[PDB]
């Protein structure tokens, strides 16, 4: 029996201070102008152009899974009609950041370079296998694994892909698409703490012992995911020196997305001490 | 295997054009200065103020309804992996059209009125009954059948509610929520537009006999929803002198739901003609 929802009636307030946070940030690419990076974009190497949209080409990829898999399989496990609203606002901005990263490919690309991106993409190994890994339990019957998963693709996994727009910001390279980037992350941001709290307001209600083993889940997916990361990043790195760099942006992104499951972090600061330039490049 | 989505190969224009004039027109409620119309709204008879609490708790029912299951319930038929993008895009808007009547309420009911609305709204057979019958076909297993079901929920079952706005702003009352109720006419004219589109689309590749039961059926399936609009219509409007204009207003979008699909007009001009103040309510 669908009843119409009432928002004058909000049992969890965090569920209307993020519909109002989400959606007073709603963007689009078009509104970035992003032709003016083409200058900046005929500076880069081959190398580093052919860098650029392979890594872009998977960010794509996980929001295209985000959009169409991970945010509808939460749905069910809504606890309330507005979480349910604030569902639908985020499985929209999925497919505005997948959309974007074609605005991207638009404005700077060739378009042969653009579709060898996407095969590399196809092909990847690492790439398929953390794709796969969140499919499998996006498609699984546990919920709470599937928001584990979700918190780890928001606030992790997109992050080794993140640094490079990041990176060439603070050389003063592609810097409007740098404000496009943060746009997406100040979205994905937000994606992962609340559906982090959620994860956390759903485990109130279980067991002790079901606690413990999906801790213990939580940090063996994460070093799983961590160690297909690092491959993935020297696949995609390696004719550059910054996988170092990649690697330490990496543990401190993944202690963000333990502290929004409302874990303790794994990695120590000195596996997780980013560059102040990348940093400032973030928040700018 | 999901893909990255590619925006540079669209398989169909519509796509795109429908992407774009969507997104483009995305707006909220708290945009719409509705507490202007606190003055207006206390100028209404108790009557009228009964009556505008009911007609919108049931457009919000419609709405939600939409969200949370017909949206949805489109995305595994979609031809291309742009609909579906389009159809994150509409379900999200769904919600705020959903969102927007507690904005209103908010602004300018009390609370009581509201809630007293809203279990009117739980109560009413006729409401209750266009909910079930859309929400039987959204859960069936013919994929025609639900975007027939999705265009009259669009483009025939709001306008019964969508009426009374579009009185008052002709009758220079409550002018910002008629402001805010044309965003919503917006954007389900452009749905109801796209959605009946697709089921011609769709229509393309099927048998010669299957057509005409389908014909058969959307036939069917609107008189019969129109009759039991003619009820609710009946059962809102009683205490008004409104019940006809309403009911040619209902037969006017009939014909406009059914040239979606393909079909030609079943109502003739003498049923469905509109007074030219509501029709300039509509567009200003």
Known sequence: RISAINWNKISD???????????????????????????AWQTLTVVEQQLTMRVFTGLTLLDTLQNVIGAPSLMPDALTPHEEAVLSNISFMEAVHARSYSSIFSTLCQTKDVDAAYAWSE????????AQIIQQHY???????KKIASVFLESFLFYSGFWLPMYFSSRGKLTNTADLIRLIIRDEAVHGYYI????????????????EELKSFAFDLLLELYDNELQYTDELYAETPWADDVKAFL??????????????????????????????????
Request: hydrophobic share 35%; aromatic share 8%; net charge neutral.
């Open 13 to 39: 307030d965090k569920d209307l201070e993020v519909w109002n946070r989400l959606t007073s940030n709603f963007w689009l690419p078009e509104k970035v102008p992003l032709s003016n990076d083409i200058p």
């Open 123 to 130: 092909e990847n190994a690492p790439l398929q296998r953390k």
């Open 139 to 145: 498609r699984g019957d546990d919920p709470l694994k």
């Open 196 to 211: 982090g709290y959620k994860y956390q307001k759903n485990m109130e209600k279980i067991s002790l012992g079901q606690r």
């Open 251 to 284: 543990c401190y992104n993944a202690n963000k997305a333990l502290m929004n499951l409302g874990y303790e972090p794994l990695f120590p600061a000195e596996m997780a001490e980013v560059n102040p330039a990348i940093l400032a490049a973030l928040s700018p």
